[PDB]
Amino acid sequence: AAGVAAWLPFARAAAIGWMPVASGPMPAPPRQERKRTQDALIVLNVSGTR
Amino acid sequence: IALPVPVIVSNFSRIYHQNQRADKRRAQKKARLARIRAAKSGSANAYMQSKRSSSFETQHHHLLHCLEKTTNHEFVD
Amino acid sequence: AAGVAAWLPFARAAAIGWMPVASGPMPAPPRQERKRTQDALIVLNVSGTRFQTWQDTLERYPDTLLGSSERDFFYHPETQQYFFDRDPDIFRHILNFYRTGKLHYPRHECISAYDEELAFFGLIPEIIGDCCYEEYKDRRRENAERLQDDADTDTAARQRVWRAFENPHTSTMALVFYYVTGFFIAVSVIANVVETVPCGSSPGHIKELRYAVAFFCLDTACVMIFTVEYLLRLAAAPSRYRFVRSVMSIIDVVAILPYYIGLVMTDNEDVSGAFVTLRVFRVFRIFKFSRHSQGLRILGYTLKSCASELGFLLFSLTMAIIIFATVMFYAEKGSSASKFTSIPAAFWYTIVTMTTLGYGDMVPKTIAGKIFGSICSLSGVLVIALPVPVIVSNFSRIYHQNQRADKRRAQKKARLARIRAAKSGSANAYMQSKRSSSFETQHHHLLHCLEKTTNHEFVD
Amino acid sequence: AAGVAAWLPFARAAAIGWMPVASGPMPAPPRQERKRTQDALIVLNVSGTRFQTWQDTLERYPDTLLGSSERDFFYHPETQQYFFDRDPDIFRHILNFYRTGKLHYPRHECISAYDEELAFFGLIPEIIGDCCYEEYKDRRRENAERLQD
Amino acid sequence: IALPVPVIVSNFSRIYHQNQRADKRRAQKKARLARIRAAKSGSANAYMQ
Amino acid sequence: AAAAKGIAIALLVILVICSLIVTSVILLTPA
Amino acid sequence: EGLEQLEAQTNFTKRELQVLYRGFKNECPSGVVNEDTFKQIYAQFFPHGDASTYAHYLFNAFDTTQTGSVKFEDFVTALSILLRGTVHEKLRWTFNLYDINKDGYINKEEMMDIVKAIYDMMGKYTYPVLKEDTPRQHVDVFFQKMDKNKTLDEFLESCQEDDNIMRSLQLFQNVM
Amino acid sequence: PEGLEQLEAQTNFTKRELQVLYRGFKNECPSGVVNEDTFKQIYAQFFPHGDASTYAHYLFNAFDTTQTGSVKFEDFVTALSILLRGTVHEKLRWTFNLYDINKDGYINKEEMMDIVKAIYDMMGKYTYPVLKEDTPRQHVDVFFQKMDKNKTLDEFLESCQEDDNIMRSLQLFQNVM
């Protein structure tokens, strides 16, 4: 689920598990805006506390 | 004779409270497991909708498609 | 005083009040560095939170740490702001103290940390403005007694021998030492019980012609055991006479005196109607069971802890007894049976019905008897059940205290074992360093210097 | 122990007490650096507010996460401040422990969250000061019986 | 009969607690007034110095 | 437990022999 | 360590390494992940069937030295060799994962329980309606692609003899 | 004791280090006046070997002049200064006062037995050459070798330079810190 989105690479490695037993076109990644995690901390303020 | 009666009655009241709270807790646990089943059903239906036509869901559905192709069996409602 | 230094101009105007009535040289102002209040807010930091405040407020109270000059050590010139390493939320209350002039105490924060922080800034504990004092002193006393129970300092030639004898559980030794005494006191008291049954020892089946008087032999043996045990205790007392006055010791000595006094009476002049009193004290051997079960000791602590209101119980019971008896007797002094012959003969009625006991040996006859008898029964319920909870709740609280003491003793021993383990780990680390993150290096170096100055080496 | 580094010179001073009786090569100090103190206020912001503390104060307990070289996982370079993603309140008590050595525990805190934040930073429950330990153990007991049910 | 006895005994215990805490409070007030007198004496002695 | 049970029996025996000493004393003075 | 482990034991950048570490720590604050966390995460990624046994195999591959709970060092090493290493490292990892024991050869039951771990992932809501028939057609076809003689080297050379499997690996290599 | 009054004047420390010393001092004794009871466990925990309270007791009264029963920061930092970064001549005067226990500055061979046995008490039981009851008095006799055979502070102060062990042992911490 989306609650553990920090652990996609894990399952990515898990994907490599079932490669030789695969039979299909391997529809390839749906691409991305950035394959990184440089998204910086966003200062959200609440009544004067950041 | 009055020395141990408060202890006995306090223990009895405590045990009755434990029983009633355990019953309420079991009802709560049933509700929680129902909610988890509903969440899985919702994720499955979302994947169904994506099959018909957020950043994370893209790669999640991509891995689901990879599982689909590695077994050449598609998913229905 | 200095606590209202913001209000000097007020008194300055007040000075103008007594000018025409003055007669002197008017010694003029002692001058000043600045006749203003431009002293800016000084950013004083506590572990990463900035608590800005005005200088004049800080030197309002001199003797505290933030007042006077001892704050210079905490000054941080390279960034021009005071720094403290303390706790922010705690320090907020000390900050409030300067603003107002009286501290407070949070409902919900550890008294040890709060008190150590309070003493760190050099301000007296009792500045509290009697708004949280009722709670601060409560929690402080609770912590003080907690650490007093932390200080049980229980220990382990004969100085340790007698203590080990007193030790409840030394497996093979103390268990035997206690079981023999328990069995022997039990058989003594059960002998005193059975020395009365007809077939046991009394003319129950001898009128025709077994009445085996061996309970005298058993009593002699048992009391010999008591007196040798008490001689062992007397030789075991760290203070011989000073520890005689103890409760358990006095029970023991009165558990043995009746036998000796009876023997002395046997060969002394015989006084009629006196041996019954001596035989009565034969039952007090059962009191020795105090060492058997701790519940008796808890009960003794209860009755001598809430010993204040027990006097009130007795006094109010006497009041009620007298008041109701003096109306019972006059209520039906003249009747058919007229059982209530006199007030001391009505004490028995007003106490058999105040306790809600109820016999029927003497009951009211006149109508005026019934109303006041029922009133007496209800008043007895009230007065009897009034001081009950102050005793049973006190007893439960004391029992919980005595359980908590054992739990914390076990925890303290585990903590001490962990301290020893950490010390052994430190020695192991030093040995590892010798065989083969700067503080450990410097500590090993200092121990190496010890090695040379005392020409001895360290081995596991 | 390792938490008394601030008194390290004092022990050094105590050495002078036995110099006349000393008889040895005196291995001499092992190339220490920065004779005068250049301690810098290291700042730890925990999803928001920031706590400033020294380095020697933070490093006297190397077995934990804020000690050792583990904390360098959380160094956030372009701002030069450790950005822990934890709760901004319990961390105050953890820093208090580093300052003293006896960690405390207030009452108005959920055990699951407090214990999670306590184990995250590598601390262990038994370090709690005796003053708060009883109340901690009672709360842990009631939550444990809840999870038992 | 058991209905009103808990109320009566609770009230009695409460009143006894009020009395004892009032005595402790009066002792505290005596201490506080002594402290105020001491503070005035200290200020006077400081002026003397 | 069992180790304590062993010394429990051991002390039971010494209590019994003390009682048998008492029985010997009472039998010393029959009638 | 994190101060020297920049690329010595991994193929990850410093920022990627630390963010992956924080992601790992948010799930297992003790720093060491057990098998139950593996079932939890892997199932939560696939909230439509059951894949506990496949996650068991994955952890057993991950858990070197049979310690029972893998630390972060070996976990990140495995991720690096899986996602940003050479194809030989991926094939070695497939060897280790498929070799449920410490043997050399691969037998029928290994493909049996692996294909069960794959087929139980879906459930009972697929159009083809999977049954017990399909898994051992799949395993049979694997076996005719496998050597006729009753080999890890043969499985390798079959991997570098087919283009589809070779191209089935880089598409995850570049991203993340 | 103002933090700027007790600078290099009368306390040969830089103010940057003195602030850190005070911060670490009050962090262990918040009241600012250390008692001898605290003086024991703050020290014994340096050595995971046998206890050191005996030596610390003799250290405290030397630290605490006029028998105040507790040491304030001014005297503590004064002594720490004259030790760590003080004068070689002045370094050993206090230590002569330390070794002296009969108050007046005289030596009657008994003030060294206890001090040397306390110093030897650190190692405890895990020493390589196992301590024997004769070893402390033997080391006391070794110290008696270098004291005045004739029947002293003057000879000790004039012979400490003669024994170069003292000379380059005092300089271990004089230069550092």
Numbering used by the authors:
A (entry chain A): 2 to 51
B (entry chain B): 398 to 450, 472 to 495
C (entry chain C): 2 to 157, 167 to 219, 224 to 450, 472 to 495
D (entry chain B): 2 to 150
E (entry chain D): 398 to 446
F (entry chain K): 28 to 58
G (entry chain F): 37 to 186, 191 to 216
H (entry chain G): 36 to 186, 191 to 216
Text from the published report:
Modulation of voltage-gated potassium (Kv) channels by auxiliary subunits is central to the physiological function of channels in the brain and heart. Native Kv4 tetrameric channels form macromolecular ternary complexes with two auxiliary β-subunits—intracellular Kv channel-interacting proteins (KChIPs) and transmembrane dipeptidyl peptidase-related proteins (DPPs)—to evoke rapidly activating and inactivating A-type currents, which prevent the backpropagation of action potentials. Here we report cryo-electron microscopy structures of the Kv4.2–DPP6S–KChIP1 dodecamer complex, the Kv4.2–KChIP1 and Kv4.2–DPP6S octamer complexes, and Kv4.2 alone. Thus, our data suggest that two distinct modes of modulation contribute in an additive manner to evoke A-type currents from the native Kv4 macromolecular complex.
To investigate how DPPs modulate the properties of Kv4, we solved the structures of the human Kv4.2–DPP6S binary and Kv4.2–DPP6S–KChIP1 ternary complexes. However, the focused refinement improved the resolutions of the transmembrane and intracellular regions to 3.4 Å and 3.9 Å for the Kv4.2–DPP6S and Kv4.2–DPP6S–KChIP1 complexes, respectively. The structures revealed that one DPP6S binds to one Kv4.2 in both complexes through their transmembrane domains, forming an octamer for Kv4.2–DPP6S and a dodecamer for Kv4.2–DPP6S–KChIP1. In the structures of the Kv4.2–DPP6S and Kv4.2–DPP6S–KChIP1 complexes, the DPP6S transmembrane helix hydrophobically interacts with the voltage-sensing domain of Kv4.2, specifically at the lower half of S1 and the upper half of S2. Structures of the Kv4.2–DPP6S and Kv4.2–DPP6S–KChIP1 complexes adopt the S4 up and S6 open conformation, like those of Kv4.2 alone and Kv4.2–KChIP1. Structural comparisons of Kv4.2–DPP6S and Kv4.2–DPP6S–KChIP1 as well as that of Kv4.2 alone and Kv4.2–KChIP1 further support the role of KChIP1 as a modulator of the Kv4.2 S6 helix by stabilizing the conformations of the Kv4.2 N and C termini as well as the intracellular S6 helix. KChIP1 and DPP6S do not directly interact with each other in the Kv4.2–KChIP1–DPP6S ternary complex. The structure of the Kv4.2–DPP6S–KChIP1 dodecameric complex supports the additive contribution of KChIPs and DPPs to the modulation of Kv4s in the ternary complex.
